């Protein structure tokens, strides 16, 4: 198969367009001078995430492709936002599918899903990641960060802002290089040499809680716990897993292009065996997907669907396997927020493991018949593509060739789909592979009013972003491991449009100014996922030949339909169709 190298980066709190236009385009523009590149594709998401896939000619040395990519990326790194560089960009040379899933549960319910995910991130993931043959490790959960959950009524009460919180955290959770006593070059007759130790990183919520934000006129003390709740919690909250309905975390492991599957899997088990003896009580490893005896189930809801609606669908899927398929199915490991296609609130995946082959006698209890019955049983779930598959048609990109923009490319897409519908004799299931635009909240900062009041735009924007999107401030040490600190609004002050008006920003003259005084807002539509293909805006269309027709005939018709689209809209074939 043609080797693929993948770049991943992230920008916490950024929308798809922001990601695209400060990250994705910049990287793409700088992917020159790389040998044997067939094509390039990318997603920029409203999760703050970009994924760029570079697919090389068959035969290419995947080590060389990776290195040449990494090198070009390194030279583009200074062009990306500070916020993105500091998340750490990854470059990977792996299969798009999983080799195995390591599951982790706590049989004594002493640990929640969130504790288990941190345990895994903090104690297991790195050693698994440095095992040879391990191309990509996905945590089904998040590592803990120190979370500072800000309250805007309390901040306004003491005339503070997220800017003051952030500043104070950098100043008081600091690791200072302070030299030595009797350091070199020394005076003659010096008897004492000793390191000077000054501030050191904080290690606990108690410590963060006593960060001193300010001393008032009466000499009383405003501490950080006076304006914030302080707790360990995930760096993000997007991915939640379950194993047979019980709280779980895990690692989804993908094989490095060209490594050996069997040997890689053995070396993974050897490393886990080194870890088990030091597990806290209750923690246990389960093995829910080893690459037949296994299959997956994909859950894809339309964009706009929350975690709660995706969970409802996963539960129906899990319930079906744990009741209607009891006799064939040993386990289900279900992940809400990660899907076959990557990552979102509207997607999920279920890894299913079967009982021993010998105890599923009969044609009708083998993988093929099971996956078929399940797809059948899930085919009538509402507003959800749900299907079961082990691990055919055509793959078309519609392309913006003349700076037309997202909205126009959408109309041109729809015009092609509407014509493809009128040839059901030749084409079936012609459909976008991506996502539909959804409601978004457009807020316009009034530059004139901000200037008249003496409110700085950087304070406005840091206030908005930090509170509603979260900000990575700096690092701390949690049980001797380096981890992140995040400031963000407590949930309840960032839920509804009217909450915007409870956030205050301090003006140059000391007055507190509500966000309502210098902003205005409306609802509009935009994209939760912007797609690009060889550096240009694009929209991926899937489809197949109708029954009794050749892929080639179908493709021929798609090319004809495509020649009738508005000026500036081209296309190409990719993937299976190249």
């Amino acid at each position: 198969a043609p080797p693929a190298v993948t770049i991943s980066a992230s920008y916490p709190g950024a929308d798809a367009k922001t990601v695209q236009d400060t990250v994705t385009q910049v990287i793409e523009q700088n992917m020159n001078g790389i040998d044997n590149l067939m094509y390039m594709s990318s997603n920029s998401d409203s999760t703050g995430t970009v994924q760029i896939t570079l697919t090389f000619e068959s035969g290419t040395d995947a080590d060389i492709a990776q290195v040449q990519v990494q090198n070009k990326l390194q030279l583009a790194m200074p062009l990306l936002p500070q916020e993105v560089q500091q998340q750490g960009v990854s470059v990977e040379k792996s299969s798009s599918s999983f080799l195995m899933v390591v599951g982790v549960i706590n049989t004594d319910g002493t640990m929640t899903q969130e504790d288990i995910s941190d345990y895994v991130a903090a104690n297991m993931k790195d050693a698994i990641s440095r095992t040879s043959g391990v191309g990509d490790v996905q945590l089904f959960g998040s590592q803990y960060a120190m979370r500072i959950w800000m309250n805007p009524n309390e901040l306004n009460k003491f005339q503070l802002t997220p800017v003051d919180v952030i500043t104070a955290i950098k100043a008081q959770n600091a690791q200072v290089a302070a030299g030595q006593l009797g350091g070199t070059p020394p005076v003659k007759g010096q008897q004492l040499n000793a390191s000077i130790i000054a501030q050191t990183r904080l290690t606990s919520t108690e410590e963060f809680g006593k960060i001193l934000l300010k001393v008032n006129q009466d000499g009383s003390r405003v501490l950080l716990r006076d304006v914030a709740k302080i707790e360990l919690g995930g760096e993000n909250y997007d991915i939640i897993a379950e194993f047979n309905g019980q709280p779980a975390s895990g690692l989804g492991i993908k094989l490095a292009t060209g490594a050996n599957a069997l040997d890689t899997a053995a070396a993974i088990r050897a490393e886990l065996a080194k870890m088990e003896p030091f597990f806290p009580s209750g923690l246990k490893i389960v093995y829910p997907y080893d690459t037949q005896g296994v299959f997956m189930t994909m859950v894809q809801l339309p964009a706009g669907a929350t975690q709660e609606r995706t969970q409802k669908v996963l539960n129906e899927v899990t319930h079906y396997y744990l009741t209607k398929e009891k006799n064939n199915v040993e386990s289900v490991f279900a992940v809400n927020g990660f899907g076959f296609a990557g990552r979102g609130q509207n997607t999920g995946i279920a890894f299913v493991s079967l009982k021993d082959w010998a105890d599923r006698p009969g044609e009708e209890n083998k993988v093929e018949a099971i996956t078929m019955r399940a797809t059948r049983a899930f085919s009538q779930i509402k507003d959800a593509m749900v299907f079961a598959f082990n691990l055919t048609g055509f793959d078309f990109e519609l392309i913006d060739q003349a700076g037309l923009g997202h909205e126009k490319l959408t109309q041109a897409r729809n015009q092609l789909l509407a014509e493809a519908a009128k040839h059901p004799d030749m084409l079936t299931s012609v459909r976008p592979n991506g996502l539909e635009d959804t409601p978004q909240f457009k807020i316009d900062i009034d530059q004139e009013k901000a200037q008249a009041l003496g409110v700085s735009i950087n304070d406005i924007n840091t206030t908005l972003g930090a509170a509603w999107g979260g900000s990575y401030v700096n690092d701390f040490i949690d049980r001797g491991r380096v981890k992140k600190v995040y400031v963000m609004s407590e949930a309840k002050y960032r839920m509804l449009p009217d909450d915007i008006g409870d956030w205050y920003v301090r003006a140059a003259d000391g007055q507190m100014v509500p966000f309502s005084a210098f902003s205005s807002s409306r609802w509009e539509y935009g994209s939760p996922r912007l797609e690009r293909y060889n550096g240009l805006p694009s929209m991926e269309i899937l489809g197949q030949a109708a029954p009794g027709k050749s892929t080639g005939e179908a493709m021929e018709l798609m090319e004809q339909l495509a020649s009738k689209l508005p000026t500036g809209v081209g296309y190409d074939w990719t993937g299976m169709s190249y």
């Binding site: 009013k449 807002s521 409306r522 609802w523």
Partner: protein
């Protein structure tokens, strides 16, 4: 004028109004679908049809009794959306069916401010024609004239006169 959540047929209608499926809107209407079903941001099928420029659906929803002055959760009406996005025929249709030409959103923004801001000159004329207060002022104290000066659009300044 702020309408609440329907279900099943309301959801189908909202989605069909949004995608321009003229036939499907007519079927759902004949089968009793709530013509003022609202989504989570307060948008009725008329908000959707107006935003995405589907003129026939706009006419059909109005024939079947749609609230011409529906408010989304930020006080914005279908006429706002139509004026903002340059949908001339839809603007005309809405105003001919009782659209409030001077409806202000939560921010004091009127359809004329929006049409003005995006330089949609034929729409500005129709709005004035139908009684638009040319001196209406948003929360920041701006009129459509201030907008024309800030944008440097001389054609618009002369229309407002």
């Amino acid at each position: 004028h702020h309408h609440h959540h329907g279900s099943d047929l309301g959801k189908k209608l909202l989605e069909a109004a949004r995608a321009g499926r003229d036939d499907e809107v007519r079927i759902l209407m004949a089968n009793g679908a709530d013509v003022n079903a609202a989504d989570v941001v307060g948008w009725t099928p008329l908000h959707l049809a107006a935003y995405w420029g589907h003129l026939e659906i706009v006419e059909v929803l109005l024939k079947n009794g749609a609230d011409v002055n529906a408010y989304d959760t930020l006080g914005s009406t279908p006429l706002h959306l139509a004026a903002h996005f340059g949908h001339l025929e839809i603007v005309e249709v809405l105003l001919k069916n009782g659209a409030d030409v001077n409806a202000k959103d939560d921010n004091g923004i009127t359809p004329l401010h929006l049409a003005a801001n995006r330089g949609h000159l034929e729409i500005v004329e129709v709005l004035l024609k139908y009684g638009a207060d040319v001196n209406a002022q948003d929360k920041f104290g701006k009129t459509a004239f201030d907008i024309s000066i800030n944008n440097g659009n001389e054609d618009l300044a002369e229309i407002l006169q």
